[PDB]
Paper text:
In siphophage T5, the unique RBP is located at the extremity of a central fiber. FhuA, an outer membrane E. coli iron-ferrichrome transporter, is the bacterial receptor recognized by T5 (25). We present the structures of T5 tail tip, determined by cryo–electron microscopy before and after interaction with its E. coli receptor, FhuA, reconstituted into nanodisc. These structures bring out the important conformational changes undergone by T5 tail tip upon infection, which include bending of T5 central fiber on the side of the tail tip, tail anchoring to the membrane, tail tube opening, and formation of a transmembrane channel.
Upon RBPpb5 binding to FhuA, the central fiber reorganizes: The three FNIIIs strings dissociate, two strings relocate on one side of BHPpb3, and the third one on the other side. This reorganization of the central fiber is allowed by the long linker that connects BHPpb3 hdIV to the first FNIII and which now runs perpendicular to the tail axis along BHPpb3. The central fiber bends by ~160° at the level of the hinge between the third pb4 FNIII and pb4 spike: The latter is now surrounded and stabilized by pb4 FNIIIs, which interact with and stabilize pb4 spike small decoration domains. pb4 spike also undergoes structural rearrangement, with a different twist of the spike. This bending and stabilization of the central fiber bring the tail tube closer to the membrane, orient it correctly, and anchor the tail to the membrane. Upon RBPpb5 binding to FhuA, a constraint at the RBPpb5-pb4 interface occurs, resulting in the different twist of pb4 spike observed in its proximal part. This twisting of the spike would pull on pb4 FNIII-spike linker, leading to the disruption of the FNIII-spike interaction network. The association between this FNIII and the spike is thus loosened; the pb4 FNIII-spike linker reorganizes and stabilizes a new interaction network between the three FNIII strings and the spike. This series of events results in the bending of the central fiber, at the level of the FNIII-spike hinge, on the side of the tube, pulling the tube toward the host membrane. The map after interaction with the receptor contains the spike decoration domains and the FNIIIs while that before interaction contains only pb4 spike.
Numbering used by the authors:
A (entry chain f): 414 to 482
B (entry chain g): 414 to 469
C (entry chain e): 414 to 551, 562 to 688
D (entry chain g), E (entry chain f): 621 to 688
F (entry chain f), G (entry chain e): 1 to 207
Write the structure that this text describes.
Amino acid sequence: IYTQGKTWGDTKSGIWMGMDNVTAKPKLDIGNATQYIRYDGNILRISSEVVIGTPNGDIDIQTGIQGKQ
Amino acid sequence: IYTQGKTWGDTKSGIWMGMDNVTAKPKLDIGNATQYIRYDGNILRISSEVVIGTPN
Amino acid sequence: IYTQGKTWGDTKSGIWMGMDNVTAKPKLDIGNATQYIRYDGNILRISSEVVIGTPNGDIDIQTGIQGKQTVFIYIIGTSLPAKPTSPAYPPSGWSKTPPNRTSNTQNIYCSTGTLDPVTNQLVSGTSWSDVVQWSGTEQRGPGMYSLAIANLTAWNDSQANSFFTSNFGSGPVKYDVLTEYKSGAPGTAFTRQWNGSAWTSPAMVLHGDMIVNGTVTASKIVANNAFLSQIGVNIIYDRAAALSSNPEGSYKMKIDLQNGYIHIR
Amino acid sequence: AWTSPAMVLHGDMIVNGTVTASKIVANNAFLSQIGVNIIYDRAAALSSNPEGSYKMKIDLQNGYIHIR
Amino acid sequence: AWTSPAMVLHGDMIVNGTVTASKIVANNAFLSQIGVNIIYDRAAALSSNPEGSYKMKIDLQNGYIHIR
Amino acid sequence: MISNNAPAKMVLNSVLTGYTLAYIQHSIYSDYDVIGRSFWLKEGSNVTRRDFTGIDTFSVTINNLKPTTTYEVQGAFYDSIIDSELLNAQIGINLSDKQTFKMKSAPRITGARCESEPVDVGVGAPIVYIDTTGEADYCTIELKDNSNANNPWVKYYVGALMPTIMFGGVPIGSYKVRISGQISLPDGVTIDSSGYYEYPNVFEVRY
Amino acid sequence: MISNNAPAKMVLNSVLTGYTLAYIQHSIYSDYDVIGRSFWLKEGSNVTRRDFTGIDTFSVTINNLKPTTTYEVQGAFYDSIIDSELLNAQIGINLSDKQTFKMKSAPRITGARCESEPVDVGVGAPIVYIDTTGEADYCTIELKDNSNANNPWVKYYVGALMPTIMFGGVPIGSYKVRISGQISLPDGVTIDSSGYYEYPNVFEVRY
């Protein structure tokens, strides 16, 4: 499944997802030439900056936090 | 491609993946309103904790 | 949407992405049985090692970057001098080469820190080494490295070994890491750290900088520099003794645990 | 109590740049240059009051070694 | 200049293996064994030319300790 | 009979050349008192003696050079018995053999246009065509929106330099394309980056 | 006063091993009368002498070596004074100390197989699973349809040698498989390949 005129490991700005019978491994690519999330069965590469979680993800709901000197 | 009644910024839990002619950047969103993988065209955001590799 | 036959978390290679009506949580599964990126509604698992960022991603395009080391012997001195304070490759009225001396005088050198060719002066920090009288003639700290390959398809142990034995002429040391990228495509790259014998690819690689609002735990940490406000440790060896000699026979160590003392050796 | 971390690595990690964190815990640290103000014993540092530590290479202000 | 990193986290980090980086910054550290070539004071290490201005230095390689 | 033999003649491998930079891999010394290395650059009738006193590594890089100029490099290890004046006079040392090399040319762009992707149905997405001439590898290409003078420069391609370079993901509008190729060297951290050679002509991309 | 000097014994800086070619980095000669350099390999049972004309470069490439055979390297420069008979006697040569290295092993295929998933609708895509036992840095795999008397060998997989190799996109005819390993010499251009090892069995691609 992909956007029309898009191929994996290509400079186009489409999405590609499917089974690569040539290497018999699944493939993936979301993004333009520079910023992309490209995955090959052997290895995954994420060009763009990545953020995990959110600020105050594990903050106590009943009580906040604070600091003083 | 998306589950019915879903948008990249909706609070509904669902899957949304496709282009955006406004920026020509692919956009991907998968998860609920508090546990999700929001891939903006420029930055990849993950809410739920992630495990990399397997022990031994 | 899924390849025929594949199901979420199934052994056969394929992909799967869709809804879990009962749990009302999106699910995704991509990859083989051994390697896969599986995301349930509460956890994201990636078996295959992941590389985030690209080599030389955040470099200055106006000006490159390079590193160099210098060591100059620079006094016709009767007595041991005080080490230079000006960070200039020719220090304050200080020669760059061993001059001629009179019988009474002697020669003193300094293991100058890393030099920056672009600025032609000591990089910020890394002041001059202790001055030692030059008598006759004057392991290396593991560091990060990168190499360019004309046409790269996979990691090349032979190329890395040739690289180290060519540049440094001594082979890699433990904890060394070299990243190899295809010339004309920095996106495709392979990174491996040399420990013991041969190279072992790490489970994850980052090319820029890592920022963590919380804590970090690891079996061991190696870095060329550190700035810690408060540090708590039981034992502290010397780097060479710590890594080079497992028995830690030779040392110059402090011992916070048990009896606390200072040993010079 | 128990808690779930942000993300877990079951193998080693390589970072070509600098890594910043609120606090670090590890067994073995093989560095080449460290800038530290005050150092206590591992147990003493983990303690509520580090004043009872065995040794202190205080450097920010005092700059003296005191062994308890 | 303000610089965008490669990784951002907000919970905690776990690494079964080892983590390597060019340099490290952290407010606190709880370690067991350390092998280091040289130890400085944070104020000196952050400042350029640390050995020009350093409250206390120890050179483990050269077996030397200095207090001003 | 006691003596201090001079270092053996320095042997240089192929000169890896990047604009304003160089890389020379030489042999390994064997004398017991080798303390420094030097090279005599020769540009036209001008000779520059670049000296490196660091013996730790066996690769060297000249930080500063003149773009697109054939040079001549002669290197030599020198003992402690060689002084600054003696080294300047090239007396008492074994100099390397002559070697000729030429510098590289920064990438330059010839044209820029918007073309619609050939498709079997629907409105094919635009793809930007730019023709590139120069010498580099994985040259980076950027863009700037022409609506305002403060718009950021956005990278869009770092792939290998080709006579014709194509890429997508460009929003409809008018942009000024900027290129500055890169070329690395075997050395671990030496990377060469040219200046920015932006296209004088503004071009617009549309469906 | 007049005297003769034997070439200074060289030091073998390093040796990179190929299962057919050997790369050695050695110091540079320092005596004027030097005319050539020679080496004395040791198979462990028979001693083999190899010499290369010219002393321009610091590296050498010993060819025609028995794979999977450790060797010992010792050699030095011989000047015009040294004679062929005297060189064979190795009396005045003052050769370098010996050094032992292990010579790598060529790739081989442990087994050949092909399996594919049954499919409800459509056709199962053929795939080839082949398990190797080599140690080459990266290996290429060829194929040839054996049903016809003569067919040209065709490359289908290029990549790192692995315990198990997976590839697809191959036609239906029965095939014969040969596997070769290629290891890059320190010089980028030169690459040392292997004698093609072929699986005696011949199999149809799993359709």
